[PDB]
């Protein structure tokens, strides 16, 4: 039964490369608008869970936060323009001797302007936005489902959105406070969700959905790990394996802490993409439901496109092009089905499931 299926969207971290999954989501949301004869159709109307880390978490906030009309704040086609307009200002070097490359002031200001005073409890869907708390030394995952037992986690969307993207050495860590059930203050000292090993948060997102299945009847079909009843769209921001951008053990033997810090996050984020995709492929293949899991990832980033913080006009235009080209790429080797075709199929499933539930 299509009707009882659970739908999950997950978007990887990757700074300015967030243009790639936003281009994919522009295509998908456009397909849903066309099929359902509704120009106001939004991703949040079709997905039960939306997960994201860093810029993927920023995107999650923009498409799940309600406006004045209780409709998603941003259309998927407004995200790439957001990156072109605000990306150069977010990634404007502070030039300060000590501290990170960026002071994070513009990033906080634009998040505050766009999200207002909205809180995670107002999200139009279940959201999964990651961070790591350097004071408690634990991952801090923001969701709606855990607000019943943890009301202190009902933070402001701009606090969550800045925190999930606060990459060490790029932006300063974020501090903010909330209130507990008995009025006590609850503090957060947060850095980017990539530090919590979820630069790819797709497995975390389906785990939150699986936990919800134990208490929420709308998620009941996936209780007992029946991922045959789950539809998962996982979007990457690309990786690189071309020798011009990678390293040898020989040259790295004399590297100091400064050189290792510049590359350690790119390596762990690539690893999170490969490892999470491996866990998920294993799970969906074990239930003979491989085609329920669509991973849209760019495997060969080249030139300036590898850098997380290059918000030059030329690099952002190259990122739109890698996204548009990714649509025409095959889903795998030996399978001529393109990403565009698999996304049209996914769109149709999302539309049919929404229709069946309305009956």
Author numbering: 24 to 382
Reproduce text from the manuscript describing this model:
This fold and active site configuration is reminiscent of the human cytosolic phospholipase A2 family of enzymes, but it is distinct from the traditional Ser-His-Asp/Glu catalytic triads found in serine proteases and esterases such as chymotrypsin and acetylcholinesterase (AChE), respectively. Recently, interest in patatin and its homologues has been heightened by the discovery that a diverse group of mammalian lipases, termed the patatin-like phospholipase domain containing proteins (PNPLAs), encompass catalytic domains with sequence similarity to patatin.
In agreement with results presented by Rydel et al., pat17 consists of 8 β-strands and 9 α-helices arranged in a modified α/β hydrolase fold with a central 6-stranded β-sheet consisting of five parallel and one anti-parallel β-strands sandwiched by 2 α-helices in the front and 7 α-helices in the back. The catalytic Ser77 is located on a loop between β2 and α2 (termed the nucleophilic elbow) that contains the classic G-X-S-X-G lipase consensus sequence motif. Two portals were found to flank helix 7 (α7) with the first portal (portal) being 16 Å in length and lined with the following residues: Ala190, Pro191, Ala 217, Val218, Gln288, Thr291 and Asp292. The second portal (portal) is 15.2 Å in length and is lined with the following residues: Arg40, Gly261, Thr262, Lys289, Asp292, Ala293, Gln320, Leu324, Thr329 and Met331.
